[PDB]
Design a protein around this ligand. Structure first.
Ligand SMILES: O=C(O)c1cccc(O)c1O
Length: 518
């Protein structure tokens, strides 16, 4: 079985007990991403799935192009369970390449547009990817081979390097299909096999690989569809990066596909462009982050377009100020829907029948009744209305990043809960309220220190069992160390140990404290 090899390659699977419950309860279903697409072509063949400028794909056309492009990848040497990096802006051909890979059982590795070669190089190595597919909005951008020529080290195993330039027609975007006869392409992947790798939030360093299976990702999409209220008449505007988990599935373009609705792709966030598309296509839903909502609400063009069709606006990132939330609701005359989610798994939505106050003040309810949210104090669970470290496990939450055993020992609890790094509380209605991050960045005399970084090194000290690197005002760096009982755990020795390891001088603790617990 593929899972046997995957485990040896760094995949941490769902424990057998928890996997059975998720089967028994009807969470995990038996469709891969491509079996889902086939059944969507069966139900919604002639419905428009995607629009981008003057290009458009019905569900039938999406499935046909995907078959064709999958046949081409197969002829080029891509094999089932191979990892392939996919970097792309918001162009319509990205849906052909995603499902083309799914059609032969290849495994996408989703990379944000705007990630540099520095990010691509480490992701390619860590995933052992054999391919890099890069889509370009124009003939000016860097091709897949241009990016690979920037690597510091050769990567011989990443031998497939293909670029697609998005042009005025789909047929002209995929000229390599011209000499390929479409194939009955048959992958043997099961729904519980790994479907793809996502990337974690890359604000503090190199992104981590996140393995999702078909069954658990499609389950999350099914649930998101219900809570966002999507139907086959839904028209959704896509302004966020297509490669990002939010835009993909919360409820994302996959949620719209799932119901036979229409996705409208814009390469741009510019207010006037988006307002025009909303008016033109009578868009009813859009997902935003606060920075885009601020841009829209302060545009003086707001009054020049008919935005009457807007019904719901998702806002994700868990960093939405109540004042802006209320401005969103009243200015756009929509139901606000806050989304607190993460590529690693758990997603929380406010509900469409929620009071406006709840949508203003909270990030709503977990997708699954089998989702488990622990607000941890020392590790112990806290009651309602107590602020603590948000931890989670459930039917679509990863049990480990891919091919990262040392990080995994730290990013998950002993009983297998994912540690989000966020703090917050569950209120009286069981709505999550995110109030901040567990360990923010320290401002030590100009330098910005990532606590997680200093913690990793200090954990390489033999007698150390736990450390928490915090900042004090003056800002100084303090390390709270829990010993395994060692007088050699002291400031001078820890500092010299870190210097010897060649960390940045400006990231060494200025103070130590050896306690028995936090
Ligand atoms: O990564 C995120 O911030 C995010 C936000 C909302 C919904 C999601 O699925 C996410 O991954």
């Amino acid at each position: 079985m593929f899972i046997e090899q995957d485990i040896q390659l760094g995949y941490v699977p769902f424990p057998k007990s928890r996997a059975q419950q998720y089967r028994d309860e009807g969470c995990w279903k038996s469709q891969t991403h491509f079996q889902l697409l086939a059944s969507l072509k069966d139900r919604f063949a002639q419905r428009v799935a995607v629009i981008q400028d003057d290009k458009q794909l019905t569900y039938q056309q999406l499935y046909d192009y995907a078959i064709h492009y999958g046949t081409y990848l197969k002829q080029q040497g891509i094999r089932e369970t191979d990892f392939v990096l996919l970097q792309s802006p918001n162009v319509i051909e990205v849906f052909i390449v995603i499902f083309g890979l799914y059609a032969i059982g290849a495994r996408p590795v989703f990379c944000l547009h705007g990630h540099g070669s520095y990010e691509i190089e480490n992701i390619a190595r860590q995933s052992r990817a054999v391919g890099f597919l890069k889509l370009c909005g124009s003939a000016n951008e860097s091709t897949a081979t241009d990016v690979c020529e920037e690597f510091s080290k050769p990567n011989f195993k990443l031998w497939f390097r293909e670029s697609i330039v998005s042009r005025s027609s789909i047929e002209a975007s995929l000229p390599q299909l011209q000499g390929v006869a479409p194939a009955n392409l048959r992958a043997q992947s099961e729904s519980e096999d790994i479907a793809f790798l996502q990337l974690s939030g890359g604000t503090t360093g190199l992104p981590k690989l996140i393995p999702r299976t078909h069954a658990d990702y499609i389950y999350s999409i099914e649930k998101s569809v219900d809570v966002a209220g999507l139907t086959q008449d839904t028209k959704q505007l896509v302004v966020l990066p297509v490669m990002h988990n939010f835009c993909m599935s919360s409820p994302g373009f996959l949620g719209v596909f799932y119901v036979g609705g229409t996705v409208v792709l814009s390469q741009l966030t510019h207010p006037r462009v988006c307002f025009e598309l909303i008016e033109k296509y009578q868009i009813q839903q859009v997902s935003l982050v606060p920075a885009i909502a601020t841009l829209w609400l302060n545009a003086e063009s707001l009054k020049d377009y008919d935005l009457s069709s807007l019904q719901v606006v998702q806002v994700g990132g868990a960093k939405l100020l109540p004042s802006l939330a209320e401005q969103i609701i009243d200015t756009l005359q929509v139901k606000l829907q806050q989304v607190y989610g993460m590529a690693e798994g758990l997603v929380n939505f406010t509900h469409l029948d929620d009071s406006d106050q709840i949508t203003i003040q909270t990030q709503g309810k977990k997708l699954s009744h089998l989702d488990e949210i622990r607000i941890a104090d020392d590790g112990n669970a806290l009651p309602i209305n107590a602020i603590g470290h948000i931890q989670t496990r459930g039917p679509y939450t990863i049990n480990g990043y891919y091919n990262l055993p040392e990080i995994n020992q730290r990013a998950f609890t002993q009983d297998g809960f994912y540690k989000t790094g966020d703090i917050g509380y569950l209120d009286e209605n069981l709505n999550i309220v995110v109030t901040g991050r567990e360990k923010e960045q320290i401002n030590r005399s100009g330098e910005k220190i990532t606590p997680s970084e200093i913690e990793e090194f200090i954990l390489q000290y033999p007698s150390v069992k736990d450390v928490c690197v915090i900042g004090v005002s003056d800002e100084r760096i303090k390390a709270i160390i829990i010993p395994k009982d060692d007088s050699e755990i002291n400031l001078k020795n820890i500092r010299k140990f870190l210097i010897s390891k060649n960390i940045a001088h400006f990231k060494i603790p200025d103070e130590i404290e050896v306690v028995a617990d936090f």
